[PDB]
Amino acid sequence: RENVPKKARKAVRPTKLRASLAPGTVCILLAGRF
RNA sequence: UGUUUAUAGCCCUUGUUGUAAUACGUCCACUGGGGACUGAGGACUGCGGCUUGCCAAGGAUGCUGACAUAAUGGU
Secondary structure, eight states: OOOOOOOOOOOOOOOOOOTTOOTTOOOOOOSSOO
């Protein structure tokens, strides 16, 4: 019956990064191999 | 022991600095974050907003990963 998905009203917008995450900042890695 | 700001000061009233501050009550169709649960519906209609179009506006989508010899679900 070829169910067509309804037109979702979600659109992608830029992520609002944290204030303290400025470029050129020292930071600690919390996961991964490093 | 007794006295009246002196070599400490205190209390009361008024003026002033004053439209003083603050506490508190209340309101903002003011705003900035953190966490959890949920994704029902299934072309288009509607009510709105910004401007043919776009949108947070009649219910989730997007970007990725890992794993299939296991993860999940069981019995």
